[PDB]
Write a protein that binds this ligand. Structure first.
Ligand SMILES: C[C@@H](N)c1ccc(I)cc1
Length: 118
């Protein structure tokens, strides 16, 4: 039975290594697929810098900071927000990165998060 939050260590991928550059074709589908890949352990994270988003596919799924007061165990509390054509679905804090499927790419680091399973 699903707790409200789950501790995960997400592999951080470089954008040019990512083979599957998004989760789907609609805001509702990308949030659904992101959540399922997170449960299956097949989700990576790309940190956002200049040049990154134009190399990925919309709609985007971002993990954003949900609580600026405590970060339990070094796991920052986060929630999902999708973006399509400049419009965001959800409101949250600072972006930690953009989520993508992970299909065996070698990561450069891991990001510890406490994910709100909304
Ligand atoms: C089942 C497996 N081949 C797979 C990997 C990545 C995605 I996205 C969907 C399915």
């Amino acid at each position: 039975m699903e707790k409200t939050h789950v501790q995960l260590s997400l592999p951080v991928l470089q954008v040019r290594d990512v083979l599957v550059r998004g989760f789907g074709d609609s805001v509702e589908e990308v949030l659904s697929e992101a959540r399922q890949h997170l449960k299956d352990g097949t989700c990576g994270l790309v940190e956002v810098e200049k040049g990154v988003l134009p190399q990925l596919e919309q709609p985007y799924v971002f993990i954003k900071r949900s609580d600026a007061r405590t970060a339990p165990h070094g796991h920052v509390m986060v929630e999902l927000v999708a973006e399509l054509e400049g419009i965001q679905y959800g409101r949250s804090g600072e972006t930690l990165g953009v989520l993508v499927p992970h299909v065996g790419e070698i990561p450069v680091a891991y990001r510890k998060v406490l994910l709100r399973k909304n």
